[PDB]
Design a protein around this ligand. Sequence first.
Ligand SMILES: Nc1ncnc2c1ncn2[C@@H]1O[C@H](COP(=O)(O)OP(=O)(O)OP(=O)(O)O)[C@@H](O)[C@H]1O
Ligand SMILES: Nc1ncnc2c1ncn2[C@@H]1O[C@H](COP(=O)(O)OP(=O)(O)OP(=O)(O)O)[C@@H](O)[C@H]1O
Ligand SMILES: [Ca+2]
Ligand SMILES: [Ca+2]
Ligand SMILES: [Ca+2]
Ligand SMILES: [Mg+2]
Ligand SMILES: [Mg+2]
Lengths: 304, 307, 310
Amino acid sequence: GPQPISRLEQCGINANDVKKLEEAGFHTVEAVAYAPKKELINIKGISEAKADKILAEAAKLVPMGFTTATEFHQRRSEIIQITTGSKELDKLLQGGIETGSITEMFGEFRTGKTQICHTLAVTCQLPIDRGGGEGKAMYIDTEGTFRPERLLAVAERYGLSGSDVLDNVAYARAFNTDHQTQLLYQASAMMVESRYALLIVDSATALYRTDYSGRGELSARQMHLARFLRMLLRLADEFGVAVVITNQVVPIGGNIIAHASTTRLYLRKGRGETRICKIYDSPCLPEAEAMFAINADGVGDAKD
Amino acid sequence: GPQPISRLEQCGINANDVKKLEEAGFHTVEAVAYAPKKELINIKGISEAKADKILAEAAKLVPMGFTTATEFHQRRSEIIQITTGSKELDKLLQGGIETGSITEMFGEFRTGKTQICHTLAVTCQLPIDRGGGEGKAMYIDTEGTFRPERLLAVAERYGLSGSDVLDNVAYARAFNTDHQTQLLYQASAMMVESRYALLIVDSATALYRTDYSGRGELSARQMHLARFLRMLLRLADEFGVAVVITNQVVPKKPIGGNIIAHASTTRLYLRKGRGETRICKIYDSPCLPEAEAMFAINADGVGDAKD
Amino acid sequence: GPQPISRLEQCGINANDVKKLEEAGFHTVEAVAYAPKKELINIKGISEAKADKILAEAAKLVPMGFTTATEFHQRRSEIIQITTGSKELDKLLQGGIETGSITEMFGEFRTGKTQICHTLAVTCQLPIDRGGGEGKAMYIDTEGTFRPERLLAVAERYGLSGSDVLDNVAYARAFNTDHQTQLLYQASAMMVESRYALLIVDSATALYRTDYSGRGELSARQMHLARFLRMLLRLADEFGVAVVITNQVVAQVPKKPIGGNIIAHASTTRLYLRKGRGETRICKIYDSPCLPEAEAMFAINADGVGDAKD
Ligand SMILES: Nc1ncnc2c1ncn2[C@@H]1O[C@H](COP(=O)(O)OP(=O)(O)OP(=O)(O)O)[C@@H](O)[C@H]1O
Ligand SMILES: Nc1ncnc2c1ncn2[C@@H]1O[C@H](COP(=O)(O)OP(=O)(O)OP(=O)(O)O)[C@@H](O)[C@H]1O
Ligand SMILES: [Ca+2]
Ligand SMILES: [Ca+2]
Ligand SMILES: [Ca+2]
Ligand SMILES: [Mg+2]
Ligand SMILES: [Mg+2]
């Protein structure tokens, strides 16, 4: 995976600058390789020449040039996709949910988004041959809906160790936008020493609906949301995790969330426990419909 | 094709000066001729008289004077237009997408901005008889939404070889604005060895939205964007390629301000129609009337809306 | 028209001095007469005595004294104005574009400055009876947006031959500010053989935005722009042509033209363009020494700028 920031100390950078970068937020070399010189200058104890040297050393360690499309195709042919537990959804998504890209699921009030998030969180720890990724899951709730009993019930279906499953899912809650942003830095610091395969942010843009109800305060809300999405994309690129976010339709979030998201899914109520999932936006998937139901076990095919 | 910069060696310029110019970023005689004196002076190993001699020698090889409109008309009546794969869009554009100028597309999400670029990256390799440009393609990515499977599908539709079209596409990923600008210098470096016909930037204004935050950073943001667009224009002029860029839409207005509106030559406004059909409208053009067209995104790329 | 500089040889000036003047940039007696002594001294082969002798001889051939206002009124009553192709714009401008001065059009994108430039380039070749300048046109382009097909369409509208219209237009492309300034010397050199009636620069400020980037280069930018505008004024005074330039807008932190006070003070007439409905546009008088502040409406059709239909 990513190379730890300790490599720069060996490369020639003194330990004090490495500590300054670590306390700044950069942890895995590629974090400072992807950052502009302005961000490095913003650090209180780094000069322009020091920033230039650090950027050159970081660029010397990672490839940041041109390459053919054959190499990219070969690299992408081994991208890990995480299953959802439903055969129809797996067929619709052509394998499952891809890593390294942001996926957004949105719908009406209580249309089954949190159940999908729980199923993804429990299934991301499965072995690859069974459709998992062998990685710890991080769950960032902001509405207070995390129910561990659902995790126990769904893990009973696959027969995994419930205590081990609950030990492999980090949990956090945010009360305002600033804490939500700082949780991203905490996750970036935490992901260095452990293997994470799936990061979940629950229904987002909800705090921006209420905390930013003013008329002239809209621009700050939009800018903060854009920065949050950019940080999410940076994390997904850096650690190769499948960021799954959630949204709710009443619009105040705007087109920023739609542009930033790579794959979007639309969920609507059906008949009984059956619900409809429709691909809303994707660069490589056609529009289609799928039937899925949420039973007591979790998320699965609509059995009739 | 452009003349390599080595032609200045036998005109009276020693090798080390040519090496300094090549390290600066110039790789053709046209690039040296078009550059102002200030750019040449700023090089550490170049003096006043040296710059004057270099400029005179470069101007001796490149025509930079007056002509008539008949000669320009004759020259322009043979430029290459790359078809978009849709007959209606080709009729709307009166031939296809024009080389040597900048074309900008903007609109909502799922409007087909990336699908058009994916189709063009394959169509630019067709023979001129079939409507291609007979050259390679270059792709610069910002959101990381490059999918070679679309290229394979389009190549299969047009009866080409998938491996051949894959080997003819150069791909790069930009993580910030500075890398985005450095990739242009690298592209200028690598555009002399082979022949390229199309250059794609997608997106062009995505990173500027979040890289510059404070209200005191607006001027620097706009100046950086202007420099980027000027570099794109320089590449298009000196290599005769077709530059296509993509914009976001924030009854709708694209982002970027007046700089990108003035710099762009042709602007296409894309909005979703019904089903898989989309509507393209000409938003700005020096020679094209304001009209509309219908097209669809099928399983093999952008094509006519079949019903 | 102007008198060629070879006339000075009969007054007691050696041929080599005239050749030095010609290679310096002067091609008419008027250009030498208007020039200050510093410019003549700057030439390598000219001394102070030679400079003052040349200045006296040149001033002997042109009038540079006082006169009454009746004579100026009578002379100005015979000035030439070029129609814009739209009756509303001609009524607003009281005849059309005026020769001998600098006219500037500015506005955001899509407003139609380039269309007006193309229409004027075609129109300035009409006879004075029909509202033309009866001369050639010169087009200087800095953005690569020159389209001869628009010229052919506009010429077909007026029942002219397309081949002659295309033959009577000179086109140049500028790649930087230094080249943009250098093209004016060649323009002055080639304006003596034939008769020109219109000079178009489009646009005059596009390259200055990127050639000088930082705040430390603002003063040099403005001085270069001022020198370019002074050269344009000298050309307009020397050859009696109509100079039309275009400009871009910036957002006030609601749109104002770029260029600062130099281009605001230099320009004589300023036109403000903005979009109306459909293909129709609105033109407003921004600054003029003799025209009231008013508005007019025109449209961009398939055959160039014209009056809005219905
Ligand atoms: N194989 C396919 N068959 C049919 N339609 C497809 C296929 N692949 C993608 N699409 C269509 O592509 C559309 C998305 O278009 P595209 O990826 O070009 O968006 P975009 O304009 O780049 O959006 P954004 O603003 O998010 O970048 C989807 O609505 C989907 O219907
Ligand atoms: N043949 C035509 N018929 C109708 N409209 C046309 C035709 N050719 C061009 N147009 C219109 O001309 C407009 C473009 O304006 P143009 O580029 O000439 O001026 P501008 O806005 O001053 O330019 P710039 O983008 O360089 O600042 C578009 O709205 C387009 O619809
Ligand atoms: Ca999207
Ligand atoms: Ca434009
Ligand atoms: Ca004035
Ligand atoms: Mg896209
Ligand atoms: Mg224009």
